[PDB]
Amino acid sequence: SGPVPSRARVYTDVNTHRPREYWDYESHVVEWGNQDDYQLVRKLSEVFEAINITNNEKVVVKILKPVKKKKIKREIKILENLRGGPNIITLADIVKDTPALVFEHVNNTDFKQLYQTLTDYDIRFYMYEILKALDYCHSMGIMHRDVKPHNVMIDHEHRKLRLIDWGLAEFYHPGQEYNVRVASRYFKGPELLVDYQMYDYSLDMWSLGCMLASMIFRKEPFFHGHDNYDQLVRIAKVLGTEDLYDYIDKYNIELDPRFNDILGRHSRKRWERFVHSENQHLVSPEALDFLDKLLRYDHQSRLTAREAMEHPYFYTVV
Numbered sequence: 578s579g580p581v582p583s584r585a586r587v588y589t590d591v592n593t594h595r596p597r598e599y600w601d602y603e604s605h606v607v608e609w610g611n612q613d614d615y616q617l618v619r620k621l622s623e624v625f626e627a628i629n630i631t632n633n634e635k636v637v638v639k640i641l642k643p644v645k646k647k648k649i650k651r652e653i654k655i656l657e658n659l660r661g662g663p664n665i666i667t668l669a670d671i672v673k674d675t676p677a678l679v680f681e682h683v684n685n686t687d688f689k690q691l692y693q694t695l696t697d698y699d700i701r702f703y704m705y706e707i708l709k710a711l712d713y714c715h716s717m718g719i720m721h722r723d724v725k726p727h728n729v730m731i732d733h734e735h736r737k738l739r740l741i742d743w744g745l746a747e748f749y750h751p752g753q754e755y756n757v758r759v760a761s762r763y764f765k766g767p768e769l770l771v772d773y774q775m776y777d778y779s780l781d782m783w784s785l786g787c788m789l790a791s792m793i794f795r796k797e798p799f800f801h802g803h804d805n806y807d808q809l810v811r812i813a814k815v816l817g818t819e820d821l822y823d824y825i826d827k828y829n830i831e832l833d834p835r836f837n838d839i840l841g842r843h844s845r846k847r848w849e850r851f852v853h854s855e856n857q858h859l860v861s862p863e864a865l866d867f868l869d870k871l872l873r874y875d876h877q878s879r880l881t882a883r884e885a886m887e888h889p890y891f892y893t894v895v
């Protein structure tokens with residue numbers, strides 16, 4: 578038989594109706610800069626602290642390992658297209674002499690020490706700033722596909738945020754089937770876990786939901802499995818089994834020989850039950866209702882990044 582196809586609810590054709598020079602990265606002319614403009618100072622995966630000689634400016638250089646030329650091109654073209662977007666890491670330069678990407682400098686506040694200083698107001702503020710980056714990149718036809726805390730740099734001392742590591746990002750094309758290896762296991766949407774390849778921007782919205790959940794409930798990560806099979810089980814224990822099968826049925830997905838039994842039966846849990854005495858100060862009914870609308874099995878019924886910015890949760894921050 579086979580599975581039912583899917584198209585993105587919003588921003589379906591932004592790449593389709595744009596010139597080939599925008600999305601067609603494999604045949605892109607990369608204008609290489611000079612590595613001798615920059616002086617490597619310290620290693621921060623080959624990421625280096627550096628100084629631009631031509632102006633004494635602090636930068637961060639990423640030296641690219643032996644990967645396929647088309648993967649280097651994909652990341653370069655995406656960063657170039659998104660340069661100037663709110664809270665997207667700025668590509669200052671691309672250099673040779675062996676390829677390197679040069680980024681604006683950013684401090685990273687030590688997590689844990691970030692995780693202990695953060696108030697309810699800080700989370701709303703930083704979630705809003707990530708959402709401006711996601712709405713912007715989605716509107717530009719780009720999925721990030723790796724939204725997670727290690728790719729969200731928060732410079733708390735300066736109240737600053739950058740969405741980084743666009744190495745796994747892709748341009749959205751309706752009907753296209755994509756790799757399901759992408760993203761950290763813990764932030765993989767149900768679509769990636771059931772091997773449904775025709776996904777879209779909505780994946781990043783699931784990942785963002787897992788981010789909020791673990792931040793407000795203070796448990797990293799929120800859904801914790803050892804494989805893709807167990808991961809779906811951990812999500813099922815919270816969202817319930819009924820809404821999951823309603824999703825399988827809707828898209829005619831056929832489960833792996835292992836999914837059937839490990840699922841069992843689970844009711845939908847109210848989010849309030851996860852509030853305990855150490856995380857109480859970060860949670861509100863607004864926060865819980867926003868989380869509920871992001872973390873839905875159905876990728877077509879998840880809040881878009883724009884819809885999300887209109888939730889009462891962010892009212893105090895807008």
Ligand SMILES: O=c1cc(-c2ccc(O)cc2)oc2cc(O)cc(O)c12
Nearest residue numbers: 624637666681682683741742743744
């Ligand atoms: O660890 C870092 C990684 C990156 C980075 C940024 C963009 C990419 O596509 C890949 C990696 O930028 C940074 C920028 C900084 O200012 C500081 C960092 O530690 C990093």
